[PDB]
């Protein structure tokens, strides 16, 4: 069975004043803070009773800073709880000693209880007690003034009733550190009429004027026009900042070109600084692919031409030409959290306005975890957050699972959002979905279709135009085509 | 006496009102439909007339979009 509740007298109990803490003898007596001594050593016993009066559990201390917990310390334990059933205001402190403190300063006339497992179990202990606490008009959380102590407050109020919670703010670690010669009157100024705060994300409209004005000028209706197929633009009205554009398709390298192409035109035609995380390939590789693409020549794909422009100065020339406006910047590799962070500093530090993330399918590093199904989603959100939270345009490439149904991807087979990878997060969190289809064994093996699979901002979706691969220049050229 | 009949009238289609008699407090109205941005407008519209025509204070949690966006 469980540790017996410690009998007063059985263990040599006295209600003595805690001289070390400025808690009077009369105080310890009311809350049930007694001083026993069993088998030789002298222990400090805190008596936890339920609202009914019966002692349900004990928290016992010895000098050196140890414990021993008697009875059954249920997940809803509040030290002092049995003293108050109702009231206009109840202070709730982190530990027993701090409860004893407020209980002083007030001549034990008002209510104070302390958290049963305090520290970390702020959330559980609290929500376990919704009803009990709602018995009072306002709940004053007087927790520790540190890292985990402010956190405790936060998790606490979350589960605590309505517009009643108010945060205590003391000059020192806890309400007792104050008492222990310092500022009793500081504790007082909080018990009465202290801070009431909890909206860390609620935001009245009035208080957005400025943020709105500056938005309206900054971010553009026609934010960034997709290039190589008016259509993509006609339907989606562009890549507005804070959005998350998602490019997808079959085997599509067509896809990795299309994205590349866009990177190109936004980083040169338009003023915009592009940031690239091309996770598949090296940073040098992607740079070449850019240069080549910008020069309408298949650069890496040609021994001869490489040599040629290294020697004839054209390389250093082309390179300056394309790059020398500090406008392209690349994440270069060899975790999820770790990547997200790098991409953030591209946004925040070098301040690019597009970040293109080639190929979500690659999660990578933190291995002990199941379905890419689930995780793909988890990343998905951090990303959408990143996006909206910072207004960067985040294009995100993503590759297609493979049918099981008759016609494959190179057989053109169109794609739907069902057709979608993930398990819902992209299918949701993404603002525009552009898909590109290509039936590489057919009539126009170089002809590629573009479906808009979705577009929050307009919701005008569907077939949106065609392009044609120029095997020769490397580009997705725009094409004449319809019924 | 306390609870109430014609709570908060849907706007833009008497009908919604005729059939539902409105959005009474403590209820949970659920708007749904296909691809409906139509849906996201309808709700928006409501939010609009409730917070202006009617005195009512509207609170919005538009989880899809930014707070600035929805305000625009």
What CATH number does the domain containing A432 carry?
A: 3.40.50.300
d(C-alpha A357, C-alpha A334), whole Å: 15
Tally of structural domains, chain A: 2
Cβ partners under 8 Å of residue A172, min gap 6? A145, A178, A182, A183
Backbone angles phi, psi at B22, to 5 degrees: 100, -165
The two structure tokens encoding residue A291: 């240069």
Give A195's DSSP letter: -
Decide if A1 is inside a domain. no
d(C-alpha A119, C-alpha A59), whole Å: 15
Decide if A315 is inside a domain. yes
Nearest to A377 by CA among A337, A422, A431: A422
A459–B72 C-beta distance less than 8 A: no
Experimental technique behind these coordinates: X-ray
Assess whether A48 and A185 both reside in one domain.
yes
Give B7's DSSP letter: -
d(C-alpha A380, C-alpha A428), whole Å: 9
Q: Which residues in chain A are contacts of B58 at CB distance < 8 A?
A: none
d(C-alpha A28, C-alpha A20), whole Å: 13
| CB distance A130 to A78 below 8 Å | no
d(C-alpha B21, C-alpha B4), whole Å: 10
Assess whether A197 and A207 both reside in one domain.
no
Decide if A2 is inside a domain. no
A388–B71 C-beta distance less than 8 A: no
Closest partner CB to B68 (pick from A211, A456, A459): A211
The resolution of the experimental structure, rounded to one decimal in Å, is 3.5
Assess whether A43 and A152 both reside in one domain.
yes
Decide if A360 is inside a domain. yes
d(C-alpha A34, C-alpha A56), whole Å: 15
Task: Write down which residue in A202, A228, A250 finishes a domain.
Answer: A202
Q: Which residues in chain B are contacts of A242 at CB distance < 8 A?
A: 66, 69
Whole-number Cα distances in Å, A277 to A1, A134, A226, A235, B70: 59, 51, 19, 27, 30
Length in residues, chain B: 72
| CB distance A482 to A460 below 8 Å | no
CB-count burial class (<10 Å; 0-12, 13-18, 19+) for A135: middle
Assess whether A70 and A118 both reside in one domain.
yes
Separation in Å, CA of A387 to nearest CA in chain B: 10
Assess whether A324 and A408 both reside in one domain.
yes
Assess whether A325 and A262 both reside in one domain.
yes
A212–B71 C-beta distance less than 8 A: yes
Task: Write down which residue in A141, A174, A202 finishes a domain.
Answer: A202
Cβ partners under 8 Å of residue A136, min gap 6? A84, A86, A87, A88, A89, A90, A111, A164
Beta bridge partners of A140: A91, A166
Assess whether A254 and A328 both reside in one domain.
yes
Whole-number Cα distances in Å, A441 to A210, A256, A270, A394: 55, 19, 36, 32
Backbone angles phi, psi at A355, to 5 degrees: -125, 125
d(C-alpha A88, C-alpha A111), whole Å: 9
Backbone angles phi, psi at A147, to 5 degrees: -30, -80
d(C-alpha A470, C-alpha A467), whole Å: 10
The two structure tokens encoding residue A52: 């009914």
Backbone angles phi, psi at A77, to 5 degrees: -65, 130
H or E segment at A30?
helix A25-31
Cβ partners under 8 Å of residue A418, min gap 6? none
Q: Is the dihedral of CA A82, A83, A85, A87 positive or negative?
A: negative
Assess whether A52 and A184 both reside in one domain.
yes
> Coil, strand, or helix at residue A149?
helix
Assess whether A263 and A190 both reside in one domain.
no
d(C-alpha B52, C-alpha A369), whole Å: 50
Cβ partners under 8 Å of residue A274, min gap 6? A263, A266, A267, A327, A328, A329, A352, A354, A355, A356
Separation in Å, CA of B2 to nearest CA in chain A: 22
Assess whether A306 and A361 both reside in one domain.
yes
When scoring B67, B70, B72 by the number of chain A Cβ atoms within 10 A, the one with the most, hence best to mutate, is B67
The two structure tokens encoding residue A316: 């250093």
Q: How many CA atoms lie within 13 A of A394 on its CB side?
A: 31
Closest partner CB to A208 (pick from B37, B65, B71): B71
B65–A212 C-beta distance less than 8 A: no
Backbone angles phi, psi at A191, to 5 degrees: -50, -55
d(C-alpha A462, C-alpha A361), whole Å: 25
Nearest to A71 by CA among A9, A12, A13, A2: A2
- CB neighbours of residue A268 within 10 Å: 18
When scoring B34, B61, B68 by the number of chain A Cβ atoms within 10 A, the one with the most, hence best to mutate, is B68
Cβ partners under 8 Å of residue A19, min gap 6? none
Task: Write down which residue in A136, A170, A202 finishes a domain.
Answer: A202
Decide if A209 is inside a domain. yes
Assess whether A186 and A220 both reside in one domain.
no
d(C-alpha A372, C-alpha A377), whole Å: 8
Assess whether A367 and A218 both reside in one domain.
yes
DSSP A435-481: EEEE-SSSS-TTEEEEEEEEETTT---EEEEEEEE-TTT--EEEE--
Q: Which residues in chain A are contacts of B37 at CB distance < 8 A?
A: 456, 459
Decide if A438 is inside a domain. yes
H or E segment at B44?
helix B38-50
Q: Which residues in chain B are contacts of A208 at CB distance < 8 A?
A: 67-68, 71
Residues of A engaging B, defined by a Cβ cutoff of 8 Å:
202-203, 205, 208, 211-212, 215-216, 242, 388, 456, 459, 461
What is the residue range of A457's domain? 203-480
Q: Which residues in chain A are contacts of B64 at CB distance < 8 A?
A: 456
Strands of A87-93's sheet in order across: A78-79, A112-115, A87-93, A136-142, A165-167
| CB distance A171 to A186 below 8 Å | yes
d(C-alpha A248, C-alpha A259), whole Å: 10
Decide if A116 is inside a domain. yes
DSSP A32-70: TEEE--BTTB--EEEEEE-TTS-EEEEEEEETTTEEEEE
When scoring B36, B71, B72 by the number of chain A Cβ atoms within 10 A, the one with the most, hence best to mutate, is B71
When scoring A208, A221, A241, A431 by the number of chain B Cβ atoms within 10 A, the one with the most, hence best to mutate, is A208
Q: Which residues in chain B are contacts of A216 at CB distance < 8 A?
A: 72
d(C-alpha A434, C-alpha A426), whole Å: 12
Nearest to A415 by CA among A459, A381, A461, A380: A461
Separation in Å, CA of B65 to nearest CA in chain A: 7
The two structure tokens encoding residue B2: 């306390």
Unique residue bearing structure tokens 């016992």: A60
């Amino acid at each position: 069975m469980t540790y017996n509740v410690w009998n007063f007298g059985e263990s040599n109990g006295r209600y003595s004043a805690l001289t070390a803490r400025g808690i009077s003898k009369e105080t310890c007596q009311k809350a049930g803070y007694w001083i026993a001594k069993v088998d030789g050593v002298m222990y400090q016993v805190a008596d936890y009773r339920d609202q009914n009066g019966n002692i349900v559990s004990q928290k016992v201390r010895d000098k050196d800073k140890n414990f021993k917990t008697t009875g059954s310390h249920k997940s809803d334990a509040l030290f002092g709880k049995h003293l108050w059933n109702g009231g206009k205001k109840i202070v709730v402190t982190e530990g027993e000693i701090d409860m004893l403190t407020v209980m002083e300063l007030q001549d034990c006339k008002y209510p104070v209880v302390s958290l049963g497992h305090g520290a970390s179990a702020a959330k559980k202990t609290c929500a376990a007690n919704y009803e009990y606490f709602d018995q009072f008009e306002q709940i004053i959380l007087m927790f520790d003034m540190d890292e985990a102590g402010r956190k405790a407050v936060e998790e606490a109020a979350q589960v605590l009733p309505a517009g009643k919670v108010r945060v205590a703010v003391l000059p020192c670690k806890d309400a007792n550190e104050c008492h222990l010669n310092g500022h009793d009157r500081e504790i007082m100024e909080q018990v009465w009429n202290a801070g009431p705060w909890i909206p860390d994300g609620v935001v009245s409209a009035l208080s957005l004027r400025e943020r709105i004005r500056e938005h309206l000028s900054s971010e553009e209706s026609v934010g960034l026009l997709f290039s190589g197929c008016t259509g993509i633009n006609d339907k989606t009205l562009g890549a507005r900042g804070g959005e998350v554009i998602m490019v997808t398709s079959g085997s599509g390298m067509v896809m990795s070109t299309f994205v590349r192409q866009q990177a190109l035109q936004w980083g040169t035609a338009m003023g915009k600084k592009v940031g690239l995380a091309m996770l598949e390939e090296s940073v040098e590789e992607t740079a070449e692919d850019l240069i080549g693409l910008h020069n309408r020549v298949r650069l890496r794909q040609s021994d001869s031409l490489k040599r040629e422009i290294i020697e004839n100065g054209k390389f250093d020339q082309w390179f300056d030409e394309l790059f020398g406006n500090d406008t392209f910047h690349l994440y270069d590799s060899f975790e999820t959290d770790r990547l997200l962070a790098k991409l953030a500093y591209m946004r925040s530090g070098l301040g690019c306005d597009v970040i293109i993330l080639d190929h979500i399918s690659i999660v990578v590093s933190a291995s002990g975890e199941s379905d890419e199904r689930k995780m793909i989603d988890n990343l998905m959100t951090k990303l959408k957050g990143f996006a909206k939270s910072t207004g960067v345009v985040l294009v995100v490439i993503c590759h297609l699972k493979n049918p099981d149904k008759g016609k494959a991807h190179e057989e053109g087979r169109p794609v739907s959002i069902t057709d979608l990878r993930g398990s819902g997060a992209l299918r949701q969190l993404s603002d525009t979905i552009i898909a590109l289809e290509r039936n590489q064994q057919g009539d126009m093996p170089n002809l590629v279709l573009v479906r808009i699979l979705k577009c929050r901002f307009t919701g005008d979706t569907g077939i949106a135009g065609y392009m044609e691969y120029n095997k020769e220049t490397g580009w997705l050229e725009p094409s004449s085509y319809s019924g």
